[PDB]
Tab-separated table of C-alpha atoms and ligand atoms in Angstrom:
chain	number	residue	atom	x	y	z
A	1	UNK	CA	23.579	-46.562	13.374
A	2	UNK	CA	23.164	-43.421	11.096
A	3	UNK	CA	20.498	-41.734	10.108
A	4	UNK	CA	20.895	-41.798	6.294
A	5	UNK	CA	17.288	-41.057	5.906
A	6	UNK	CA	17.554	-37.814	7.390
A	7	UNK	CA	20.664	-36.873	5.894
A	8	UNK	CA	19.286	-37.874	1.765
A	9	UNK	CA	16.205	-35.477	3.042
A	10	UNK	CA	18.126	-32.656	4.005
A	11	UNK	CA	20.128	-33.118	1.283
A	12	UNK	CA	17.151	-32.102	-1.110
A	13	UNK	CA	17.122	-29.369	1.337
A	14	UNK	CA	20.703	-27.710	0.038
A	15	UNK	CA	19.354	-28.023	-3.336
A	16	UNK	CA	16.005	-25.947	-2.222
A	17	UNK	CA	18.382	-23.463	-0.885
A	18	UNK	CA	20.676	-23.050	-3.686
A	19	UNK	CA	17.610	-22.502	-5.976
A	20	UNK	CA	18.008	-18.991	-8.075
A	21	UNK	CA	14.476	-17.102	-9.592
A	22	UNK	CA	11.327	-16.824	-8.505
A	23	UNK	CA	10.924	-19.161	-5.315
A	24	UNK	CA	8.181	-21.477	-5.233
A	25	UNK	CA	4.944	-20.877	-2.614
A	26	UNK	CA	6.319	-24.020	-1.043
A	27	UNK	CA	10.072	-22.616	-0.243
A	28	UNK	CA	11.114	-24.242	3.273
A	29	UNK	CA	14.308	-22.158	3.581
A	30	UNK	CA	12.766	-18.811	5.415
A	31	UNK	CA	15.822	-17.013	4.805
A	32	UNK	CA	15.837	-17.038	1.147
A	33	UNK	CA	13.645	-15.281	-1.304
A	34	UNK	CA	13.296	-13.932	-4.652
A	35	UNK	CA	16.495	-13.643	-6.601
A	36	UNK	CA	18.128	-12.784	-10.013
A	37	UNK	CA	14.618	-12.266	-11.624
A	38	UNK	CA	16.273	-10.188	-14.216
A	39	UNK	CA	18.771	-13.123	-15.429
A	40	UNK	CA	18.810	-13.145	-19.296
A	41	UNK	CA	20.278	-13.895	-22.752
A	42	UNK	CA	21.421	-11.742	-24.917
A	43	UNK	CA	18.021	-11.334	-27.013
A	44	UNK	CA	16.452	-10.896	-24.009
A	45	UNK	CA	15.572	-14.823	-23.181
A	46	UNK	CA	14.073	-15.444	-19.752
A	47	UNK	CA	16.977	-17.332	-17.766
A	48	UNK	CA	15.652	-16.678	-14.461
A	49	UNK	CA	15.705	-20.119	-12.402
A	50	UNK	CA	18.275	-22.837	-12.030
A	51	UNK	CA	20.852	-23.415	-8.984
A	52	UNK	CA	23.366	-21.275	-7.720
A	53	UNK	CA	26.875	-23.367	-7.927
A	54	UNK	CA	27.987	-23.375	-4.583
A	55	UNK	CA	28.418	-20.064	-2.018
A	56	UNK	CA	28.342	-17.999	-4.582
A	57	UNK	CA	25.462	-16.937	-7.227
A	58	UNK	CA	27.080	-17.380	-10.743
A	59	UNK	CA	24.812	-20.476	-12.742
A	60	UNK	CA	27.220	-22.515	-13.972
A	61	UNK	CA	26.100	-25.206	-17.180
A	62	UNK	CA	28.449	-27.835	-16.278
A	63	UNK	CA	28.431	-28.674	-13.057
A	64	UNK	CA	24.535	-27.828	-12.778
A	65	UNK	CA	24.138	-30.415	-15.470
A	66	UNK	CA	25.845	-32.962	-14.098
A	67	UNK	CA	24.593	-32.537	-11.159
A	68	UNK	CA	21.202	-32.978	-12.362
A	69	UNK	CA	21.512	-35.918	-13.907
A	70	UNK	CA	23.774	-37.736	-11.187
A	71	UNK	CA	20.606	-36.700	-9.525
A	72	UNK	CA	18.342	-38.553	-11.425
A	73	UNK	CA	20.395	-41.533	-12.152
A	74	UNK	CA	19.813	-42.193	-8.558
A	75	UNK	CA	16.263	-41.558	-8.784
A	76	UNK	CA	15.501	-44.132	-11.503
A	77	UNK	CA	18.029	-46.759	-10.619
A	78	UNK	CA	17.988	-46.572	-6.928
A	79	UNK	CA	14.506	-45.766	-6.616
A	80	UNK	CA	13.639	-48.093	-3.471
A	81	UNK	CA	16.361	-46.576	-1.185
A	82	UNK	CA	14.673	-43.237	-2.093
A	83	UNK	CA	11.271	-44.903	-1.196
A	84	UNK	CA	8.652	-41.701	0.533
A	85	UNK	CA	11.498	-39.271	-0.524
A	86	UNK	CA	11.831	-39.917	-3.835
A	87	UNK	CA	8.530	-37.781	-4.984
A	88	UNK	CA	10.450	-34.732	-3.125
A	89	UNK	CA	13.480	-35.291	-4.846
A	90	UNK	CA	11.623	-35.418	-8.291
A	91	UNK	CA	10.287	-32.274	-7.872
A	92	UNK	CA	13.956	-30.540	-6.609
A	93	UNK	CA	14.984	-31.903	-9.892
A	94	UNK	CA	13.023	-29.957	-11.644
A	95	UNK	CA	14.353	-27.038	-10.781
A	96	UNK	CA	17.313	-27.467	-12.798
A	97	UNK	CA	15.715	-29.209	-15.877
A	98	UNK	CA	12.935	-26.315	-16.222
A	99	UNK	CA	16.721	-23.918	-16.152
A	100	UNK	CA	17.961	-26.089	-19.020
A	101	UNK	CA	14.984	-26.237	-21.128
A	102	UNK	CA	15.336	-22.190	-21.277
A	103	UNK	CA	19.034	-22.026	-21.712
A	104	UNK	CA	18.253	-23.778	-24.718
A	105	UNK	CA	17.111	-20.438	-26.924
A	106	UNK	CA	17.212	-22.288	-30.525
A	107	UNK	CA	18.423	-25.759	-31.968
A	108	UNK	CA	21.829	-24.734	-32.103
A	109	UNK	CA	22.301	-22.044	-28.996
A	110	UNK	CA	22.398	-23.696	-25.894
A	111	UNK	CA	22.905	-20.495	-22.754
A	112	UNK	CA	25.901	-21.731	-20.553
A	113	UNK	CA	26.803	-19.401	-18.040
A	114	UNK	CA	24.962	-16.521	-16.304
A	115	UNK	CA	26.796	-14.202	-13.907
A	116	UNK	CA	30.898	-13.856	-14.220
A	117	UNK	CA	32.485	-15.402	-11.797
A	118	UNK	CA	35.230	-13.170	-10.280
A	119	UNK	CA	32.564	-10.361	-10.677
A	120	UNK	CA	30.369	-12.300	-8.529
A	121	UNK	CA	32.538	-13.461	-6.127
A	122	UNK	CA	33.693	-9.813	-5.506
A	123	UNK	CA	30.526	-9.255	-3.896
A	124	UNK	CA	29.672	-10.522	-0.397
A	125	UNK	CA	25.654	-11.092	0.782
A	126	UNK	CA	22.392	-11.829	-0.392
A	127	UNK	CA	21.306	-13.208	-3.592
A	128	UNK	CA	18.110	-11.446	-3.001
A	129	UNK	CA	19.806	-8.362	-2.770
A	130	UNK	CA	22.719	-8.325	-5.598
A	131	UNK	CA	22.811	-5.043	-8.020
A	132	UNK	CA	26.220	-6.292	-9.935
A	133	UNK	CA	25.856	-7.038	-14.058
A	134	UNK	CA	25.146	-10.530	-14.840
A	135	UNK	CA	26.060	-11.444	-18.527
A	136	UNK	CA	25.323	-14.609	-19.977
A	137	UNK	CA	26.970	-16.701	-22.496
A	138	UNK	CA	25.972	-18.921	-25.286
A	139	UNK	CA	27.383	-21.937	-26.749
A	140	UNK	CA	26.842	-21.417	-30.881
A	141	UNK	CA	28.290	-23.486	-33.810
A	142	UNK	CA	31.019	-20.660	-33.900
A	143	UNK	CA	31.129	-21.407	-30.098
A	144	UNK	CA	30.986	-24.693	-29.631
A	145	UNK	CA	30.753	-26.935	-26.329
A	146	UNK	CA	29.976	-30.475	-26.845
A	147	UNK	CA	31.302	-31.019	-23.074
A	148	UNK	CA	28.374	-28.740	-21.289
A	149	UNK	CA	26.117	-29.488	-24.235
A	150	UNK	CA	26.579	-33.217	-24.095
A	151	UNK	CA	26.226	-32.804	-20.276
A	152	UNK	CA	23.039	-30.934	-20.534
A	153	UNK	CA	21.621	-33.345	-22.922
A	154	UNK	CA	22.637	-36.473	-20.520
A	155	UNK	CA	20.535	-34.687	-17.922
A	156	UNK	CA	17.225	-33.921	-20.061
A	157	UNK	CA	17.416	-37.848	-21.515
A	158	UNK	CA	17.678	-39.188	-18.189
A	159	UNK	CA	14.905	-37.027	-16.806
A	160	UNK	CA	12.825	-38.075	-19.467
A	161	UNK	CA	13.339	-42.041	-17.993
A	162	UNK	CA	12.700	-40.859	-14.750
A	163	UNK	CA	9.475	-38.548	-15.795
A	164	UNK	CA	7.765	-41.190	-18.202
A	165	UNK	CA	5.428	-42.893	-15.703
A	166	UNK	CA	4.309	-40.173	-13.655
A	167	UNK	CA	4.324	-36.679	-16.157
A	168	UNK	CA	3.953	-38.314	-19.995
A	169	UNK	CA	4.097	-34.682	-21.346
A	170	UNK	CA	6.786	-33.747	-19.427
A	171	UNK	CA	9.069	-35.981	-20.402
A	172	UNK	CA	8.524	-35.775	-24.003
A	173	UNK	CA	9.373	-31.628	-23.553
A	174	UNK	CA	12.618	-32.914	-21.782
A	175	UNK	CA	13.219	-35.791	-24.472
A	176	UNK	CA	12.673	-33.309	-27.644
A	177	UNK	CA	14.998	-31.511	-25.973
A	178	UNK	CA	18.130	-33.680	-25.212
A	179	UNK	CA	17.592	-34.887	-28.915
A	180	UNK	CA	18.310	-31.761	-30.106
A	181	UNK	CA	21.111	-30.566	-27.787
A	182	UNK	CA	22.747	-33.481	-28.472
A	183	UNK	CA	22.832	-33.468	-32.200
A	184	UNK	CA	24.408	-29.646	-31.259
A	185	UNK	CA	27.294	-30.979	-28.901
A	186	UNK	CA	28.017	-33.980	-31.822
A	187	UNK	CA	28.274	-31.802	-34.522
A	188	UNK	CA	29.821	-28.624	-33.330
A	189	UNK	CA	32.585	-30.079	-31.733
A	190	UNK	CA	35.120	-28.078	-28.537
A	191	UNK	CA	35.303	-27.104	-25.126
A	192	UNK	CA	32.936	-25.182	-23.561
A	193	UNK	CA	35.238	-23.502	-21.384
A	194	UNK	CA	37.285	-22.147	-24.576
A	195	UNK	CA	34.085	-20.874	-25.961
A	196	UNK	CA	33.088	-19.334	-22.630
A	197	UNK	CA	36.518	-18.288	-21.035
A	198	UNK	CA	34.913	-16.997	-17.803
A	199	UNK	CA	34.213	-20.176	-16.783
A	200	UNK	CA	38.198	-21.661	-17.344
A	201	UNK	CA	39.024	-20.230	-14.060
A	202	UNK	CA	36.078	-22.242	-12.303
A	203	UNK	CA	34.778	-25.031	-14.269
A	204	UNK	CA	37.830	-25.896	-16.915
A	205	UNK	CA	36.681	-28.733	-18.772
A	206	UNK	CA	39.566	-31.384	-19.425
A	207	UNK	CA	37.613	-33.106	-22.589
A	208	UNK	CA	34.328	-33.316	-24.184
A	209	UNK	CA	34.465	-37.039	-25.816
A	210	UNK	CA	33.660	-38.158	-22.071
A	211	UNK	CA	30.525	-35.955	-22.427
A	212	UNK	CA	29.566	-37.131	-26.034
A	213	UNK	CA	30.018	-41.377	-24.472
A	214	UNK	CA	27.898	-40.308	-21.923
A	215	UNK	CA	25.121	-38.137	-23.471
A	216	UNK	CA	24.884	-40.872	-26.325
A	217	UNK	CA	24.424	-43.718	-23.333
A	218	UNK	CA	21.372	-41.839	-22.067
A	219	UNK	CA	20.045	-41.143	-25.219
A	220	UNK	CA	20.143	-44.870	-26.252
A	221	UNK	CA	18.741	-45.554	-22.231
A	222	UNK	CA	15.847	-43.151	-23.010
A	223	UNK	CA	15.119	-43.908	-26.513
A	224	UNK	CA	16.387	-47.561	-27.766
A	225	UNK	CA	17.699	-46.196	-30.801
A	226	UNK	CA	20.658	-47.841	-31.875
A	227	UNK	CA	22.372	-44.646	-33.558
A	228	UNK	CA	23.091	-43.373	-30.375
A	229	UNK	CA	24.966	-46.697	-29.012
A	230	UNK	CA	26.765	-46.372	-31.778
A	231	UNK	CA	27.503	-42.670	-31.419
A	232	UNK	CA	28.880	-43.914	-27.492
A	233	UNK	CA	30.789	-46.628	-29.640
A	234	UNK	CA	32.994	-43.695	-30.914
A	235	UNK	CA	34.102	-41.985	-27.973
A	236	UNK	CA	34.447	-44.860	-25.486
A	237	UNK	CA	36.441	-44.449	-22.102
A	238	UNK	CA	39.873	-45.647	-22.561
A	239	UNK	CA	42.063	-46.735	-19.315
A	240	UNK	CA	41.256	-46.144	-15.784
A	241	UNK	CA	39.262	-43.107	-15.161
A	242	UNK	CA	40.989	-41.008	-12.361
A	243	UNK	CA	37.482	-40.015	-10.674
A	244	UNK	CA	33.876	-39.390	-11.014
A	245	UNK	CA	32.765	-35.758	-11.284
A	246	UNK	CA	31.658	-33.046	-13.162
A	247	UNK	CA	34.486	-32.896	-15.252
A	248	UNK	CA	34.727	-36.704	-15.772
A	249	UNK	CA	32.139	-38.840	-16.550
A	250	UNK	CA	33.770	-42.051	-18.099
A	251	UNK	CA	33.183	-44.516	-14.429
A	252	UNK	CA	29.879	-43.418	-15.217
A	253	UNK	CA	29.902	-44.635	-18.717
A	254	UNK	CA	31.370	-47.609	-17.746
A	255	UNK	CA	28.635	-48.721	-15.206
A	256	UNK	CA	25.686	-47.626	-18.191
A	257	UNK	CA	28.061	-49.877	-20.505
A	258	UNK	CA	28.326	-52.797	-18.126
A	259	UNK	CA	24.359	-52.242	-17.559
A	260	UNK	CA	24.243	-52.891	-21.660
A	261	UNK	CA	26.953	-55.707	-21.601
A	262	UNK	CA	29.818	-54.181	-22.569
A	263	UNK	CA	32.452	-56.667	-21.622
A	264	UNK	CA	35.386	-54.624	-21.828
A	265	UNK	CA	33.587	-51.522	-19.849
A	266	UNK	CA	33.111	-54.468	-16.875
A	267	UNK	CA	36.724	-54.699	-16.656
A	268	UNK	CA	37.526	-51.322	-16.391
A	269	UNK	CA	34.689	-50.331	-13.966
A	270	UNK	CA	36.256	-53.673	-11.748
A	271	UNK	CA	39.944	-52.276	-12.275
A	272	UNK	CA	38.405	-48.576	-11.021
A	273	UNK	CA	36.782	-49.853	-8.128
A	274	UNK	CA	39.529	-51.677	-7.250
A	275	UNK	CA	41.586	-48.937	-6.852
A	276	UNK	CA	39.221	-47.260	-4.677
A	277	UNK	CA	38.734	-50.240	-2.076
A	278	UNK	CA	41.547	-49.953	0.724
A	279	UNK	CA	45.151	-50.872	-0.375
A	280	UNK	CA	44.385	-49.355	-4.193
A	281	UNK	CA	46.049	-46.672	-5.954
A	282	UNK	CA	44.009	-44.164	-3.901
A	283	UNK	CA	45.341	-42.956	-1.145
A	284	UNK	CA	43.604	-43.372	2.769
A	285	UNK	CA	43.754	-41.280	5.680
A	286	UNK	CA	44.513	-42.632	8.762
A	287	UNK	CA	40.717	-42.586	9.380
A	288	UNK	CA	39.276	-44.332	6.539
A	289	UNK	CA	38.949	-41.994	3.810
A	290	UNK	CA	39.917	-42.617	0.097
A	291	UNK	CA	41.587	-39.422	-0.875
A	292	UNK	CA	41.558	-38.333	-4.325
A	293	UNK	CA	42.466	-34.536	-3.727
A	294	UNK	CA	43.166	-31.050	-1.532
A	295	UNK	CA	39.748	-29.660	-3.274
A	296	UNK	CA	35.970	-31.708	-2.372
A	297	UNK	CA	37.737	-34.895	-1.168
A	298	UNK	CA	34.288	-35.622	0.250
A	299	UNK	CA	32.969	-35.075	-3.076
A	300	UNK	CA	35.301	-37.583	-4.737
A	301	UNK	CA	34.929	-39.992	-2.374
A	302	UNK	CA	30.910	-39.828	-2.127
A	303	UNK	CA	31.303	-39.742	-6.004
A	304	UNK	CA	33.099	-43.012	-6.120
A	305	UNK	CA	30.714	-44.440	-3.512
A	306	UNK	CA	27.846	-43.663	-6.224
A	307	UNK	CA	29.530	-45.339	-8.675
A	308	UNK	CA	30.717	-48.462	-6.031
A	309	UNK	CA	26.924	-48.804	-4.791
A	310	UNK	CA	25.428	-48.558	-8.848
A	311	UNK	CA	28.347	-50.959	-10.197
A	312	UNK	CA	27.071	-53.526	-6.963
A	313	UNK	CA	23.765	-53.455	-8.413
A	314	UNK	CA	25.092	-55.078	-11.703
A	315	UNK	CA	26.644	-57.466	-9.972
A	316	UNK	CA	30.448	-55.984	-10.074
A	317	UNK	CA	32.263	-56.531	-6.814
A	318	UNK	CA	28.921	-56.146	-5.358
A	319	UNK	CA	29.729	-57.053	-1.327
A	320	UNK	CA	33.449	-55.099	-1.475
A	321	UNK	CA	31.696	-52.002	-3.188
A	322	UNK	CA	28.752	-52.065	-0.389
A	323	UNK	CA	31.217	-52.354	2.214
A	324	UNK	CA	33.466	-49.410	0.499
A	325	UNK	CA	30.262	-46.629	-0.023
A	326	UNK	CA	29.483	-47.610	3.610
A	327	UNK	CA	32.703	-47.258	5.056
A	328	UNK	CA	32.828	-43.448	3.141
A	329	UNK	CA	29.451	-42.754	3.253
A	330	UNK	CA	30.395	-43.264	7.500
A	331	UNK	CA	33.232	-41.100	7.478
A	332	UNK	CA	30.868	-38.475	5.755
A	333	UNK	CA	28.279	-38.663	8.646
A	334	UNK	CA	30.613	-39.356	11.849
A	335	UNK	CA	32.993	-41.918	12.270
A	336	UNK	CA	35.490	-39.790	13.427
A	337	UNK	CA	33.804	-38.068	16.031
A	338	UNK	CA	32.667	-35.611	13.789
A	339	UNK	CA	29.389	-34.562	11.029
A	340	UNK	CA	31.068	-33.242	7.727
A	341	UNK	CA	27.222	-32.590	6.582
A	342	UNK	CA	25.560	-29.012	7.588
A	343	UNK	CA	22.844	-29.179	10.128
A	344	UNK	CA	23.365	-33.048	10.630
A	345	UNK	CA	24.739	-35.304	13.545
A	346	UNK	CA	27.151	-34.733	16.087
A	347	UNK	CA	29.453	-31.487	15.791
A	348	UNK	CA	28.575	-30.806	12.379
A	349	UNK	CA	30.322	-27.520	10.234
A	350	UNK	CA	29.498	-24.635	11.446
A	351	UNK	CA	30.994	-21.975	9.068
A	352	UNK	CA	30.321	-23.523	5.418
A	353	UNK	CA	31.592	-20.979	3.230
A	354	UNK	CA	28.400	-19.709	1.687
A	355	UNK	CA	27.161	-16.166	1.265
A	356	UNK	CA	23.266	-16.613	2.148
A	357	UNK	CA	24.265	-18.535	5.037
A	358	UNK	CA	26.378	-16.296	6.110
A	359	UNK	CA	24.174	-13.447	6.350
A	360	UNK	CA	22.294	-12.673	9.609
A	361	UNK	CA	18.212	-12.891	9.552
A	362	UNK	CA	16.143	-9.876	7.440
A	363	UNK	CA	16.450	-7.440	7.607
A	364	UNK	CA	19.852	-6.820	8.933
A	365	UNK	CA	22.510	-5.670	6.487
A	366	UNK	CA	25.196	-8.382	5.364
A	367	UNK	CA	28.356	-7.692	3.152
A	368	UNK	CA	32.033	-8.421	3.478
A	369	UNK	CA	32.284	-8.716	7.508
A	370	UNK	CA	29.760	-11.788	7.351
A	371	UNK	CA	32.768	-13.459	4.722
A	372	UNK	CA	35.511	-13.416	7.633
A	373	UNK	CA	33.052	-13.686	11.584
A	374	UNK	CA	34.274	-16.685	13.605
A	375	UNK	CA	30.740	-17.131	14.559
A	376	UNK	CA	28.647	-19.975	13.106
A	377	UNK	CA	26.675	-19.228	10.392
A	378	UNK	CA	23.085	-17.298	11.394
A	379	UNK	CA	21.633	-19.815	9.289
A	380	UNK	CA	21.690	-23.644	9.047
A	381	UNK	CA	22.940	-24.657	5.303
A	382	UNK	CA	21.228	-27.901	6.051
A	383	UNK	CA	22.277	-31.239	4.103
A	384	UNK	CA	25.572	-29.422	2.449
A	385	UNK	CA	28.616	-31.721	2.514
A	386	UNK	CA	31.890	-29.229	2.651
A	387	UNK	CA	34.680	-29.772	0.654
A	388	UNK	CA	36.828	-31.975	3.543
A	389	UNK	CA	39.952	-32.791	5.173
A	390	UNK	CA	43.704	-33.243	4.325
A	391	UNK	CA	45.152	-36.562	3.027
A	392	UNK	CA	45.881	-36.668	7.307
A	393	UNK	CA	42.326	-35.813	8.319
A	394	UNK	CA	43.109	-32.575	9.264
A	395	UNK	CA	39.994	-30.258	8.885
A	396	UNK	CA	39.469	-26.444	10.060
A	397	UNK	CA	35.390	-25.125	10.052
A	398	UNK	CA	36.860	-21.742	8.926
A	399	UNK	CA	34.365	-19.593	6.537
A	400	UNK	CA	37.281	-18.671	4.435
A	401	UNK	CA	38.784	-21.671	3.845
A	402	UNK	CA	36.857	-22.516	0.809
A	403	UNK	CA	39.026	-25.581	0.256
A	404	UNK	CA	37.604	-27.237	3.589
A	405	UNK	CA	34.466	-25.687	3.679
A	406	UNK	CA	32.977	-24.873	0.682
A	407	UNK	CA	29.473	-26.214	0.072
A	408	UNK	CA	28.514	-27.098	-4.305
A	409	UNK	CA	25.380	-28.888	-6.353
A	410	UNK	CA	28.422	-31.157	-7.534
A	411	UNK	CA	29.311	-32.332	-3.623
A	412	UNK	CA	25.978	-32.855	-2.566
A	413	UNK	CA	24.879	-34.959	-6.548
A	414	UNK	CA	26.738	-38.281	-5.838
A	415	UNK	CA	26.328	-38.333	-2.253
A	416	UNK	CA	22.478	-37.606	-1.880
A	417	UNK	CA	22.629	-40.666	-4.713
A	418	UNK	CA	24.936	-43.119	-2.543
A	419	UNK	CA	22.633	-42.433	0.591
A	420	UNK	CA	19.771	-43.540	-1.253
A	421	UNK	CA	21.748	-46.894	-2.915
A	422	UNK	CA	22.680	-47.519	1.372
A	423	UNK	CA	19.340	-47.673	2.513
A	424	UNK	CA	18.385	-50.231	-0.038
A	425	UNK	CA	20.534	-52.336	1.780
B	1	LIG	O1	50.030	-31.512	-1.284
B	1	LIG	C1	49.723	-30.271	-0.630
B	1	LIG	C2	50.849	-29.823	0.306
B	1	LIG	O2	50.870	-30.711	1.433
B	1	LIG	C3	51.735	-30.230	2.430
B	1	LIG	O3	51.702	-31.222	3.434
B	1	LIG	C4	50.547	-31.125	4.277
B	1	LIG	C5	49.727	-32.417	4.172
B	1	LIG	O4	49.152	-32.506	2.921
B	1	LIG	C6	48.594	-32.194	5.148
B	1	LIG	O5	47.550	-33.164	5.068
B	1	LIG	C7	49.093	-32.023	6.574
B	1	LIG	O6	47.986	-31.900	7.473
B	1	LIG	O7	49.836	-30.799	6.598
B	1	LIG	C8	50.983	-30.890	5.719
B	1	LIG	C9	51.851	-29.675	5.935
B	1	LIG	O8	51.197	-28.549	5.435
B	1	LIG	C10	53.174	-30.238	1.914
B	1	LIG	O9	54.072	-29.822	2.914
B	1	LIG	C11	53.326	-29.360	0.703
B	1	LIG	O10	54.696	-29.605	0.312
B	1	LIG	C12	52.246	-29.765	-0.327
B	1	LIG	O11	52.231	-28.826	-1.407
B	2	CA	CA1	34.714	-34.206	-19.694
B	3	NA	NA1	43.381	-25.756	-26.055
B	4	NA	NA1	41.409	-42.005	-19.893
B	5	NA	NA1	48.225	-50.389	-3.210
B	6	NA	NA1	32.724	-58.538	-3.173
């Protein structure tokens, strides 16, 4: 009945248009350019590149590594449902890996932030066309994140698994990489968002030892090395995580531990899903949605799809979970009436809040009056799932309501992941 094909390749599309730096020759999204080319550390390190966070331009470490390797997590393990899109969505990938590889200056300074964030979102228009300061931040020993770091680390080891057969030398640069970012996040431990306070207003981490399970599980994925099993061993997810996201990562851990034959991880990835399927802990709308929160209830629900559809494929609740990611996946696409994905289906958003998108075609001036037009967007943000409705369904396309209708890498990472693990059904 839906088109989830067409939805997982627009998806890839969002990321293309969130992409900061120099654009590649191939850009399909005509009305973005060139951006941020002067992004840099504070010795003057090249940190042009990476994705803008959501409808604004600040590059933010944790979500944009979790993202990534949410990302690739689908890539590698649902691999047939991306079938003749999965080489596109490799190279999207990229985009945030090649960011990550730079932000990582020396063994033990790892770059986590580049623009501040109430600086940026003081400004309203182009990326292509901001003038404001953009200071970066570093996570040092004195600075510590193991949360971001273990995060980024996570995403370089898995990209290594998913690079190995096609781009040897490739994945060895990501590999050498997440070794070494890792060993930085285990031994210099705390919470990125103390060490970088701009971002504890945005992206407040809640806990690193999630991070440090997590990085350690794709480390021992990517490398066999039993050190890093038992470095997950130490900081394994106790009780019932309360969702998957950026901030959480433990009902990811759990599926990687059940994958490994953890026997206690099974139960507790059985006694989260559980909660999820209808008459849980979660709460439903009247029309079908499990709820988690005001803020991306799409997200949280295409999150715990992405974990429902992975845990199925290790043979946990398999049928209930399918039937669960379907039923939200659904709601995400149209079953009530309505598209809550950009540019897809029948009466899809028209307002995402999201400053490029906003902005009417070159060469036309855009600033604060594009933030607050009732008109739809000049451009077509296409593949972005908005934040969502109430806990009744209740839903208002409004640019400014950036609780509704704001568009982030973290929405779109579990979703584009669950539409693949559908259409290997
Ligand atoms: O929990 C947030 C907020 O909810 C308010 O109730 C909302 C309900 O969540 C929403 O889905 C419905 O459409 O509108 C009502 C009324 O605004 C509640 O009244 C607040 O007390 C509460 O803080
Ligand atoms: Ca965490
Ligand atoms: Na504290
Ligand atoms: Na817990
Ligand atoms: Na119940
Ligand atoms: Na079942």
């Amino acid at each position: 009945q839906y088109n989830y094909r067409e939805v997982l390749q627009k998806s890839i599309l969002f990321y293309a248009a969130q992409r900061s730096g120099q654009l590649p020759g191939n850009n399909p999204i005509d009305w973005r350019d060139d951006s941020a080319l002067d992004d840099q550390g504070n010795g003057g390190e090249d940190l042009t590149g990476g994705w803008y966070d959501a409808g604004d331009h600040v590059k933010f470490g944790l979500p944009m590594a979790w993202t990534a390797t949410t990302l690739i997590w689908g890539m590698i393990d649902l691999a047939n449902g991306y079938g003749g899109d999965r080489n596109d969505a490799m190279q999207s990938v990229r985009w945030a890996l090649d960011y990550f590889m730079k932000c990582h200056v020396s063994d033990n300074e790892l770059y986590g932030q580049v623009g501040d964030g109430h600086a940026d979102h003081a400004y309203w228009g182009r990326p292509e066309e901001m003038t404001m300061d953009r200071p970066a931040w570093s996570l040092t020993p004195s600075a510590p994140g193991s949360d971001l770091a273990g995060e980024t680390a996570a995403a370089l080891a898995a990209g290594s698994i998913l690079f190995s057969d096609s781009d040897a030398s490739y994945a060895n640069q990501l590999l050498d990489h997440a070794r070494t970012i890792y060993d930085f996040a285990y031994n210099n431990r705390g919470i990125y968002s103390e060490s970088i306070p701009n971002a504890a207003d945005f992206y407040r981490s809640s806990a690193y030892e999630d991070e440090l399970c997590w990085g350690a599980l794709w480390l021992y994925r990517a490398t066999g090395e039993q050190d890093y099993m038992d470095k997950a061993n130490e900081f394994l997810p106790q009780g019932r995580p309360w969702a998957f996201s950026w901030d959480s990562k433990e009902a990811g851990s759990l599926v990687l531990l059940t994958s490994f034959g953890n026997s206690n991880a099974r139960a507790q990835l059985e006694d989260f899903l559980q909660s999820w399927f209808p008459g849980g802990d979660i709460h439903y709308t009247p029309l079908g949605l499990a709820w988690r929160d005001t803020w991306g209830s799409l997200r949280y629900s295409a999150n715990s799809a992405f974990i429902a559809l992975l845990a199925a494929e290790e043979g946990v609740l398999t049928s209930q979970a399918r039937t669960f990611a379907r039923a939200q996946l659904d709601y995400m696409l149209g079953s009530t009436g309505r598209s809550f994905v950009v540019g897809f289906g029948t009466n899809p958003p028209l307002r995402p809040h999201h400053r490029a998108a906003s902005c009417p075609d070159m060469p036309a001036s855009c600033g604060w009056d594009q933030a607050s037009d009732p008109a739809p967007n000049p451009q077509v943000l296409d593949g972005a799932l908005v934040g969502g409705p109430d806990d009744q369904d209740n839903y208002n396309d409004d640019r400014q309501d950036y609780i509704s209708n704001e568009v982030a890498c973290d929405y779109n990472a579990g979703f584009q992941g669950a539409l693949a693990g559908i259409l290997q059904l």
